[PDB]
Design a protein around this nucleic acid. Structure first.
Ligand SMILES: [Mg+2]
Ligand SMILES: [Mg+2]
Ligand SMILES: [Mg+2]
Ligand SMILES: [Mg+2]
Ligand SMILES: [Mg+2]
Ligand SMILES: [Mg+2]
Ligand SMILES: [Mg+2]
Ligand SMILES: [Mg+2]
Ligand SMILES: [Mg+2]
Ligand SMILES: [Mg+2]
Ligand SMILES: [Mg+2]
Ligand SMILES: [Mg+2]
Ligand SMILES: [Mg+2]
Ligand SMILES: [Mg+2]
Ligand SMILES: [Mg+2]
Ligand SMILES: [Mg+2]
Ligand SMILES: [Mg+2]
Ligand SMILES: [Mg+2]
Ligand SMILES: [Mg+2]
Ligand SMILES: [Mg+2]
Ligand SMILES: [Mg+2]
Ligand SMILES: [Mg+2]
Ligand SMILES: [Mg+2]
Ligand SMILES: [Mg+2]
Ligand SMILES: [Mg+2]
Ligand SMILES: [Mg+2]
Ligand SMILES: [Mg+2]
Ligand SMILES: [Mg+2]
Ligand SMILES: [Mg+2]
Ligand SMILES: [Mg+2]
Ligand SMILES: [Mg+2]
Ligand SMILES: [Mg+2]
Ligand SMILES: [Mg+2]
Ligand SMILES: [Mg+2]
Ligand SMILES: [Mg+2]
Ligand SMILES: [Mg+2]
Ligand SMILES: [Mg+2]
Ligand SMILES: [Mg+2]
Ligand SMILES: [Mg+2]
Ligand SMILES: [Mg+2]
Ligand SMILES: [Mg+2]
Ligand SMILES: [Mg+2]
Ligand SMILES: [Mg+2]
Ligand SMILES: [Mg+2]
Ligand SMILES: [Mg+2]
Ligand SMILES: [Mg+2]
Ligand SMILES: [Mg+2]
Ligand SMILES: [Mg+2]
Ligand SMILES: [Mg+2]
Ligand SMILES: [Mg+2]
Ligand SMILES: [Mg+2]
Ligand SMILES: [Mg+2]
Ligand SMILES: [Mg+2]
Ligand SMILES: [Mg+2]
Ligand SMILES: [Mg+2]
Ligand SMILES: [Mg+2]
Ligand SMILES: [Mg+2]
Ligand SMILES: [Mg+2]
Ligand SMILES: [Mg+2]
Ligand SMILES: [Mg+2]
Ligand SMILES: [Mg+2]
Ligand SMILES: [Mg+2]
Ligand SMILES: [Mg+2]
Ligand SMILES: [Mg+2]
Ligand SMILES: [Mg+2]
Ligand SMILES: [Mg+2]
Ligand SMILES: [Mg+2]
Ligand SMILES: [Mg+2]
Ligand SMILES: [Mg+2]
Ligand SMILES: [Mg+2]
Ligand SMILES: [Mg+2]
Ligand SMILES: [Mg+2]
Ligand SMILES: [Mg+2]
Ligand SMILES: [Mg+2]
Ligand SMILES: [Mg+2]
Ligand SMILES: [Mg+2]
Ligand SMILES: [Mg+2]
Ligand SMILES: [Mg+2]
Ligand SMILES: [Mg+2]
Ligand SMILES: [Mg+2]
Ligand SMILES: [Mg+2]
Ligand SMILES: [Mg+2]
Ligand SMILES: [Mg+2]
Ligand SMILES: [Mg+2]
Ligand SMILES: [Mg+2]
Ligand SMILES: [Mg+2]
Ligand SMILES: [Mg+2]
Ligand SMILES: [Mg+2]
Ligand SMILES: [Mg+2]
Ligand SMILES: [Mg+2]
Ligand SMILES: [Mg+2]
Ligand SMILES: [Mg+2]
Ligand SMILES: [Mg+2]
Ligand SMILES: [Mg+2]
Ligand SMILES: [Mg+2]
Ligand SMILES: [Mg+2]
Ligand SMILES: [Mg+2]
Ligand SMILES: [Mg+2]
Ligand SMILES: [Mg+2]
Ligand SMILES: [Mg+2]
Ligand SMILES: [Mg+2]
Ligand SMILES: [Mg+2]
Ligand SMILES: [Mg+2]
Ligand SMILES: [Mg+2]
Ligand SMILES: [Mg+2]
Ligand SMILES: [Mg+2]
Ligand SMILES: [Mg+2]
Ligand SMILES: [Mg+2]
Ligand SMILES: [Mg+2]
Ligand SMILES: [Mg+2]
Ligand SMILES: [Mg+2]
Ligand SMILES: [Mg+2]
Ligand SMILES: [Mg+2]
Ligand SMILES: [Mg+2]
Ligand SMILES: [Mg+2]
Ligand SMILES: [Mg+2]
Ligand SMILES: [Mg+2]
Ligand SMILES: [Mg+2]
Ligand SMILES: [Mg+2]
Ligand SMILES: [Mg+2]
Ligand SMILES: [Mg+2]
Ligand SMILES: [Mg+2]
Ligand SMILES: [Mg+2]
Ligand SMILES: [Mg+2]
Ligand SMILES: [Mg+2]
Ligand SMILES: [Mg+2]
Ligand SMILES: [Mg+2]
Ligand SMILES: [Mg+2]
Ligand SMILES: [Mg+2]
Ligand SMILES: [Mg+2]
Ligand SMILES: [Mg+2]
Ligand SMILES: [Mg+2]
Ligand SMILES: [Mg+2]
Ligand SMILES: [Mg+2]
Ligand SMILES: [Mg+2]
Ligand SMILES: [Mg+2]
Length: 144
RNA sequence: AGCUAGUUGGUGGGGUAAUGGCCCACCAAGGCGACGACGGGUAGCCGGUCUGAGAGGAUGGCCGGCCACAGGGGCACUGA
RNA sequence: UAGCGCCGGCCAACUCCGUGCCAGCAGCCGCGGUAAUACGGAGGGCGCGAGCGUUACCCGGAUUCACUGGGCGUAAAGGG
RNA sequence: GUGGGAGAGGGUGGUGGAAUUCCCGGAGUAGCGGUGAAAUGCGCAGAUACCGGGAGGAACGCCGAUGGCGAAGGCAGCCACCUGGUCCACCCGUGACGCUGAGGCGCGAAAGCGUGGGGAGCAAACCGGAUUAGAUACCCGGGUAGUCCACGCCCUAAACG
RNA sequence: UGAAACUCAAAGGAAUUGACGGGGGCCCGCACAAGCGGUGGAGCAUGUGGUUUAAUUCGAAGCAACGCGAAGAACCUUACCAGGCCUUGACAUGCUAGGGAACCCGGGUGAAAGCCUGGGGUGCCCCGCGAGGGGAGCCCUAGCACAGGUGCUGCAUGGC
RNA sequence: CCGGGCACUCUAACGGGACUGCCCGCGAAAGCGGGAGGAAGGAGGGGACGACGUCUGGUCAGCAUGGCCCUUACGGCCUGGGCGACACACGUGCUACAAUGCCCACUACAAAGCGAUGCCACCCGGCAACGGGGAGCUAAUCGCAAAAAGGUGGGCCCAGUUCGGAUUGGGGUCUGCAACCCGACCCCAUGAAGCCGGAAUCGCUAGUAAUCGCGGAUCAGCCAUGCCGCGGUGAAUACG
RNA sequence: CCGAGGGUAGGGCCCGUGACUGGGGCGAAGUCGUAACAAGGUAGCUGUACCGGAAGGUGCGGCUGGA
RNA sequence: CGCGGGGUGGAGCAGCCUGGUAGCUCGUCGGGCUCAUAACCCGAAGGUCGUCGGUUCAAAUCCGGCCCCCGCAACCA
RNA sequence: UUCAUG
RNA sequence: CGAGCUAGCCCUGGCCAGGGUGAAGCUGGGGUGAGACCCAGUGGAGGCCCGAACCGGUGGGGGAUGCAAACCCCUCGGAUGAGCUGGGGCUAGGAGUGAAAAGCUAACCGAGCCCGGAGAUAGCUGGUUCUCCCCGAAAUGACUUUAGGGUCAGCCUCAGGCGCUGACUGGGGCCUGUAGAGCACUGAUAGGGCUAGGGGGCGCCUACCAAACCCUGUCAAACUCCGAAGGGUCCCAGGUGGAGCCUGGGAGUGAGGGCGCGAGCGAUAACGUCCGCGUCCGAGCGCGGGAACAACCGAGACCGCCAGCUAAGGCCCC
RNA sequence: CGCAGUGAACAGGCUCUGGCGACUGUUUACCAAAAACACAGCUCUCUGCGAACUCGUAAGAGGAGGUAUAGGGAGCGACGC
RNA sequence: UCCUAAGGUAGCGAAAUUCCUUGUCGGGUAAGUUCCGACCUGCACGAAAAGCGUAACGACCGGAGCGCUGUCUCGGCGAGGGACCCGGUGAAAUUGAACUGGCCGUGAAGAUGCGGCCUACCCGUGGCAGGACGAAAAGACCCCGUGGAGCUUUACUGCAGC
RNA sequence: UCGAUCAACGGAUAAAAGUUACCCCGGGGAUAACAGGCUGAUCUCCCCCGAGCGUCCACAGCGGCGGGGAGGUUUGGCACCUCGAUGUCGGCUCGUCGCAUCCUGGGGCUGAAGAAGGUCCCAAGGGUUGGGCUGUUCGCCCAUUAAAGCGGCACGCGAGCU
RNA sequence: GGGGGUGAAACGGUCUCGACGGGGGUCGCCGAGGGCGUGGCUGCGCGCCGAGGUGCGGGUGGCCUCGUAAAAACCCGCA
């Protein structure tokens, strides 16, 4: 029921080489909050641990109908890919120096949520500032 | 930014070791106030101490002087 | 018995490793994004040493309340 | 003080023409208006332009300026009245009467407000026309308060040299 | 008349060098204008985006990437994917060392590579009519340092 | 083709020639407007040439290279596939959409080139691509080679056509161990879209644009219509 | 009589708090316009009034820190 | 609870005439412009016409009736 | 003389 | 005809005890250049304040055939004003007057009262006065500005004429399409088999997820291949009865109701409502039973009788 | 001197707020006195005087022996905005 | 984006207006459907049928405190005038006759009167009011009347006036 | 032969709309609102079947889908008495009754260790509070209580009152 | 206290919009996770009972030798 979400800083931070419509296996209740918009990806990507992907460190609120049936909210959820795609990205992590970041969590005609993963390079826009006068002149005094 | 009505002054007392509205009677309208009265906040004050180039700024612990307090407040007695 | 601070500049004393805008540092400027003399450790150094640092407070720097010792066109400031 | 001087200094009272609008009459005919270009609008109900007469309001072209006066605001047709400031000369008189001034008091553009009056132009608001993505704006048509007078308040300003 | 809380490490004045201007002046270039022929319409070729894919290798991204690196992709190229495989290896040597030392011929398994496999067997250092032994190139085995990377980073770089 | 021979065109060295050099007008001078002679004019026309630096431009995938990472794999070998896929979009080009055009024949006219495991003359065979002999060339000597557009005179008759040549089927030749993904051509069928193009946009100031072919590179073949060069015909306009 | 203290009633000053609200600072590369600085594409700023989501616009006047 | 009024493109709406002839703005997709997004320009495309049953040759059109939405009433006691 | 933003 | 109440106005008289606040002025002072202004005093202003008379009537209580067809008590509002009030006067009926309520206008005003038209009209309610005897309804249809009324027909009576025709029955002959029942049609249908179009991957393909057929099942007011009881009509008969048919006079009635049966509406509710066939009450509750009780059961009251037999119902007593 | 001194009688309960109406008034005689009506004030409109308007068939009268700062009507109802 | 002539401005705002509604928060109270202050998805405020304020004022209306109290928990006592007794004068509305019990039924559907039972000597006086569908007013609400008025109007038709 | 949405269609006028809470008259229980009645759809109660819960186990407690009643207190339906009047909501006052019980007294089961409680059977003899808000019955609360009963009696009660 | 409504969207008809692991099943040859294997093929099969060996030997039970009976230490302390 939720619209397309946004990984705001990752869309505006990492260069998206290509995408995948991945999948998430929700571990039992973390559904309606993601169906109402409670998701914040800041400090999260999708990390493998030697066989499979987990969407790491994603904070979703435990739903308030479960008065005591809450879940640890920022966890590593079992992401879903294909198997050749999965071992492909498992290779590509060590081939190219990537980081695998989500872009959105959008729903399909089966009424399911799919986390749109995407590749990174870094998109290094960070300006290493040119040297001010009071360091260039003491480097020049060293050069004297 | 006005304040004060024992407030300001006199006379006559009373009390005090003693002057004094220190307190009481009667009369007189006075006393104070932008040189900061009144109200509020803060504060023991000073020799000093610290700092400062000096002027000054801060501070008043210990030591020394003085006031005030002795659970808060009032009150006299005794006695120099 | 020798420790504590500090080593980007101010401020005396610099390399390596680990970290990768994270963990963290910080008094200001700012460092941190994969070669970090600014973070964490080691080496080395510097300062002080039974102390070294931090904090708060005060004075100095602050000529930044200017009496010594500032200004007022445009900088804050001329009153219509 | 004596003699003058210049001045949009201020206030009162008149007064003059141009121009705008409106009215009235004469003529007039298919448009005028408007912009960068248009439409809105005004117009065959005789509009625009043109002539003549009248009303009435406001500002005063040229002179006129890099001018003058005023303490500041400001102040501009001309006349008269009342009146301030200021300057020159004479060196005539007073004999330091001086200067600045917190608080005061007065003046204080323009806007604004009150009570009347006046209302021609201009014109916030407002309505329309385009404009533009949108336009609450520029541009254009209209259009009230206001602008104006008198009294009375407001008392700010890039009240700046 | 006129605060503080809180916040900022600046706010700001003049001036300089630039950049910019829907600012000016002057001057220019196929920049416009004047022309002629095109593209965009169509079919194809090639390159690219995207999608697909097991992979559709990667890089280039306004001008200044897009008939470009690619002045030759059936395999080679090929870096990619799939599968068969090999491990100090296609290679550069250099060491310890039983071995074979230069090398030729095939057979079998196999998609090929690879792996398994049998017949001829070295002048020379040499003391040699001697048994031969130290032992010099090269080559295979077991190892060693290492080779290798079209893996990343052209904001760490040279070069261009 | 030579016998005689080099006159020339040429070839490729070395030289000259063009500099405001002359003269006039303007002008302080530089220089400008013009003229003459010259083959040429006021940088004669083109190249190569691209400053200090910017875009933290591009390339670690041409190489070199610091750093980090893989080291029975991210290395290495091979077979096969892909790099060519396709719902579409884009960029650059090519052919087109015709009668100034197209088809067949015939005859001209270039420079630049490039070739001993190559270019292949000239025959024979095959309509043809090509195949079998084989001449010459170590190449101003032989070859690619035909030049095309032009011209000649025959066709077509404004027609989606004798325009167009995409597509698809069939017959084949070469290269290569190998043409199915995916080669090039040849031939015979096929004959589509397309009848000058939206909003926009590009190229060009003289041998330029336009049109036409040729060569080369890499290369077994080739994707080539691309690129790099060469010449043939050869404009309009630039008021400003 | 005065008298500390207590009460009552009403003042003053200061402080905490108060649904809600007006603004203010400050966040993350939010939305919305483009007001300013270039004749900021309507010269700007200010007084004041009115209006307008909003910067702002317009009127009257000033100023030049505009031509 | 009863009247009457709508249902039409992603949304907002014209409509559709006895039934046969369906569109408009914005949005959309592709292009063009732009350094890039806006804006603007060019090509189209999109709809079981509220479901359902009815007479009809044929329904979106006309007749019912049912579901959502709108506007009304729900008065006298 | 038009025309908003990174 | 009334403004003798009241509402307003005109003229002319009256009335308002007493206190209190302290306005403008005026006087003096402060101030200033002059003032504005600010103090004190003085003054006496007011739809000013408290408050009696007076006017009014706010809240409550009493009163309620009262003391009174508006009162009394307590409490209140105004009380020098838009005041109150005496006298003299004006205005009058769709008109006056109104500080507005449609209030007031002679004790009841959305149009006074009195007389007259006028014995208005009343589809309405009431009421209708002696006796006996005979016969005796209806509450239905059509139409109504009609629904409580009326016209006509139906039912009723009277008189006359006609003379077995009448209700009822028997015999015949028909008509019809209800109850039943059945799928022959129009539809709805349940299970199984067969098999056209969509759904599972869809190339032929896969469960009654699905037409027609097919056996077996059913249902219908708007279905009938059938279809009775009956009912209607005609004829031939029985039928002498407050039977009929016709003409004329007089009507009443057109609010019906219960019960039974057939149905509708409702809920397979109502002493519900609307019909059809009756019946009964209406008008027979007059009587018996039902405990009582119009319509249930029995039965049609001319009168009498201290006779009898009986119906429904009873038989222990009441 | 009383418990008590307007010693009896007459003789205000007050405050905080909020609505509505500015206020004082006036009304529904005889169930409503109010948040109604009026009210000064505000604007609109009409009327140049044989005035509009009103009453009356007409004269005539009110208007008014008034004259736009005046009358008639309508609305709102002090004041502030 | 459609419609309009135009889409409600300021100021108010669950209101004398808010249906849902006791909106939802606050405040007061122990507890507050009312009150006050707020927020405003205002069925349906809103600018001279004026809007929002407003000091004074009000026999207005709403809500709180304080004081005081028989208003009340919850009543009590006492006086006076009636009431009650006696003497005097002595009305009234109403009235079918009444020799007028209660309950279960029943009946025009709410009985003293009918049936069954159960109580019950005849007659008063003072009382309370439950019944006699008590009285009063030929319902004042509703309906019918082809009634009647008042009033309105872009009902119809006239007339005044113009 | 033509002029009728004279369609209110056997056609009142050739021509006609509203309102009355300012009302008035004649009438009606022919015709409503209150109440009663008949009914019992709805409402309240208990009653069957028992899927299914209740870890297990239909039944301690529950009880789908459905069914059968009772009671007349709700909202109604019907219009039968009353419109020549049956005064009408609530409160006060006084009560009285029913049981389908809220306590209290008994008791059964219990998923009843004890204390509690739940549910069901008997059981009206006695109770069943004081407040805040609202006109309120009813509710929401406040503080209690052993419990703060559900009703009827013309939604008891106005010839008793407000 | 009841009526309405959702707390993943065709008034049914499918699938984890496809994939990830966790459960189970299918397919094959890969010959082997395990193994009955299985016949063309192709033997004389060598363990007891035993003692010993390298530079001064605790180790090392057959890591080797060998039959009327006897041979070498592949490593460890290693002055
Ligand atoms: Mg940064
Ligand atoms: Mg940086
Ligand atoms: Mg710096
Ligand atoms: Mg002493
Ligand atoms: Mg003293
Ligand atoms: Mg100092
Ligand atoms: Mg003390
Ligand atoms: Mg003490
Ligand atoms: Mg002493
Ligand atoms: Mg140093
Ligand atoms: Mg970290
Ligand atoms: Mg540190
Ligand atoms: Mg690193
Ligand atoms: Mg480092
Ligand atoms: Mg300091
Ligand atoms: Mg200092
Ligand atoms: Mg000084
Ligand atoms: Mg400044
Ligand atoms: Mg200044
Ligand atoms: Mg003047
Ligand atoms: Mg001057
Ligand atoms: Mg002198
Ligand atoms: Mg002004
Ligand atoms: Mg004003
Ligand atoms: Mg003014
Ligand atoms: Mg517009
Ligand atoms: Mg004004
Ligand atoms: Mg001023
Ligand atoms: Mg100002
Ligand atoms: Mg100035
Ligand atoms: Mg100035
Ligand atoms: Mg431009
Ligand atoms: Mg094209
Ligand atoms: Mg084309
Ligand atoms: Mg690419
Ligand atoms: Mg390029
Ligand atoms: Mg290939
Ligand atoms: Mg290949
Ligand atoms: Mg080896
Ligand atoms: Mg880096
Ligand atoms: Mg570079
Ligand atoms: Mg040249
Ligand atoms: Mg590298
Ligand atoms: Mg790379
Ligand atoms: Mg290299
Ligand atoms: Mg490899
Ligand atoms: Mg390629
Ligand atoms: Mg092309
Ligand atoms: Mg041709
Ligand atoms: Mg060549
Ligand atoms: Mg040959
Ligand atoms: Mg050659
Ligand atoms: Mg040649
Ligand atoms: Mg073209
Ligand atoms: Mg164009
Ligand atoms: Mg070539
Ligand atoms: Mg190529
Ligand atoms: Mg953020
Ligand atoms: Mg601006
Ligand atoms: Mg701007
Ligand atoms: Mg601008
Ligand atoms: Mg402008
Ligand atoms: Mg400027
Ligand atoms: Mg505004
Ligand atoms: Mg602005
Ligand atoms: Mg404006
Ligand atoms: Mg459409
Ligand atoms: Mg729609
Ligand atoms: Mg009503
Ligand atoms: Mg333009
Ligand atoms: Mg623009
Ligand atoms: Mg923006
Ligand atoms: Mg008379
Ligand atoms: Mg009067
Ligand atoms: Mg005086
Ligand atoms: Mg007085
Ligand atoms: Mg008075
Ligand atoms: Mg009275
Ligand atoms: Mg009084
Ligand atoms: Mg009074
Ligand atoms: Mg009084
Ligand atoms: Mg009289
Ligand atoms: Mg009247
Ligand atoms: Mg009347
Ligand atoms: Mg009358
Ligand atoms: Mg009569
Ligand atoms: Mg008559
Ligand atoms: Mg009738
Ligand atoms: Mg039947
Ligand atoms: Mg059938
Ligand atoms: Mg049929
Ligand atoms: Mg029949
Ligand atoms: Mg009738
Ligand atoms: Mg009878
Ligand atoms: Mg009987
Ligand atoms: Mg017998
Ligand atoms: Mg007294
Ligand atoms: Mg009043
Ligand atoms: Mg009255
Ligand atoms: Mg009053
Ligand atoms: Mg009254
Ligand atoms: Mg007069
Ligand atoms: Mg009013
Ligand atoms: Mg509200
Ligand atoms: Mg409320
Ligand atoms: Mg509360
Ligand atoms: Mg209350
Ligand atoms: Mg409203
Ligand atoms: Mg108005
Ligand atoms: Mg108000
Ligand atoms: Mg009052
Ligand atoms: Mg109260
Ligand atoms: Mg009492
Ligand atoms: Mg008796
Ligand atoms: Mg009875
Ligand atoms: Mg009897
Ligand atoms: Mg009684
Ligand atoms: Mg009665
Ligand atoms: Mg009656
Ligand atoms: Mg009638
Ligand atoms: Mg009348
Ligand atoms: Mg007429
Ligand atoms: Mg007629
Ligand atoms: Mg009719
Ligand atoms: Mg009346
Ligand atoms: Mg009235
Ligand atoms: Mg009754
Ligand atoms: Mg029942
Ligand atoms: Mg049942
Ligand atoms: Mg009952
Ligand atoms: Mg009835
Ligand atoms: Mg009645
Ligand atoms: Mg137990
Ligand atoms: Mg009881
Ligand atoms: Mg009752
Ligand atoms: Mg009563």
């Amino acid at each position: 029921m939720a619209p397309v979400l946004e990984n705001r800083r990752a869309r505006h931070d990492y260069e998206i080489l290509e995408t995948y419509e991945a999948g998430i296996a929700l571990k039992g209740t973390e559904v309606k909050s993601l169906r109402a918009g409670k998701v914040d990806f800041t400090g999260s990507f999708a990390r493998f641990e030697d066989g499979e992907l987990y969407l790491e460190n994603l904070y979703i609120a435990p739903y308030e109908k479960g008065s005591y049936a809450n879940v640890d909210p920022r966890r590593k959820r079992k992401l879903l890919l294909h198997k050749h795609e999965l071992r492909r990205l498992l290779g590509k992590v060590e081939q190219k120096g990537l980081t695998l970041v989500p872009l959105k969590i959008y729903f399909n005609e089966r009424g399911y949520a799919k986390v749109l993963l995407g590749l990174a390079r870094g998109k290094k826009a960070y300006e290493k500032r040119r040297e001010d006068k009071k360091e260039a002149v003491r480097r020049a005094l060293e050069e004297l």
